[PDB]
Design a protein around this ligand. Sequence first.
Ligand SMILES: Nc1ncnc2c1ncn2[C@@H]1O[C@H](COP(=O)(O)OP(=O)(O)O)[C@@H](O)[C@H]1O
Ligand SMILES: [Mg+2]
Length: 214
Amino acid sequence: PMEEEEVETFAFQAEIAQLMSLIINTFYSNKEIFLRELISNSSDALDKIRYESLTDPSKLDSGKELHINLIPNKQDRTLTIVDTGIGMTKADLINNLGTIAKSGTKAFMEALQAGADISMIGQFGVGFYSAYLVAEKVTVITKHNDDEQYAWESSAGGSFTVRTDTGEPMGRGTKVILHLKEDQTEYLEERRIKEIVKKHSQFIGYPITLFVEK
Ligand SMILES: Nc1ncnc2c1ncn2[C@@H]1O[C@H](COP(=O)(O)OP(=O)(O)O)[C@@H](O)[C@H]1O
Ligand SMILES: [Mg+2]
C-alpha cells in the first residue's frame, strides 16, 4: 500500500544562505576538516544522551551502545556518518539546521574574505555547513525519542526540505549522508579516512568504527 509523506520547504536564513554559496563556489585548501566537524557533532549528540540519564532515569533502559560509524559506499559515491546520539525532533531540525541566525556567520564570512583557514568554521558556530566543501547534496535522517523519523535534505540553492521518513527505521540517533562531488572521491578510500580521523578527531570520547566494503 502506497505511503504518503508530508514535505515542507524552508528558506535558509539570509546569512547562512550566503555562507553556503561562498562555501560551494570558492576553492579552499584543507577541505578534510569537514569530517572533524561531523564527528564532533555526533560526539556532542552522544554527550546529550549521557546527561539525558539524569533528567529522566527512563533513558537508562536502552540497550544501544554510544558510538559513531563511518560508512563509505564507492558504488554510490556517498559517505554516511551514523551516531546513536540523542537525535533531533522536527522542531530541532528546522530551528538548528538552517532557519535561525547564528551570531558568528557574518564574522566568519569576513574572516574567510581576508583569507582565514576554513578550519576555523567550528569556532564560529557554523560547523555543519563544512559538509558543503565535499558534498553537492546532504541528507540528514534523524529520530528522537520524543518524535517520529524525519529526513532533512538540501542541495543548497537557498532552501531545505523536511519530510517524515517512512523508509528504513534507524532507531534513536542521526545519520548524515554526503553525496560527494565528483572531484572528492578520495574520501571514499579507507586509508584517507583513517588519515584524517587520526589527524583531527583523536580525543573523541566514544568508539568510532570505519566499515570498509570487501
Ligand atoms: N548528529 C547530530 N545529532 C544531533 N544534532 C545535531 C547533529 N548534527 C548537528 N546537530 C544539530 O545542529 C546544530 C548545528 O551544529 P553546528 O553547525 O556544528 O553548530 P554547533 O555544533 O556549534 O552547534 C547543533 O547545535 C545540533 O543541535
Ligand atoms: Mg558543531
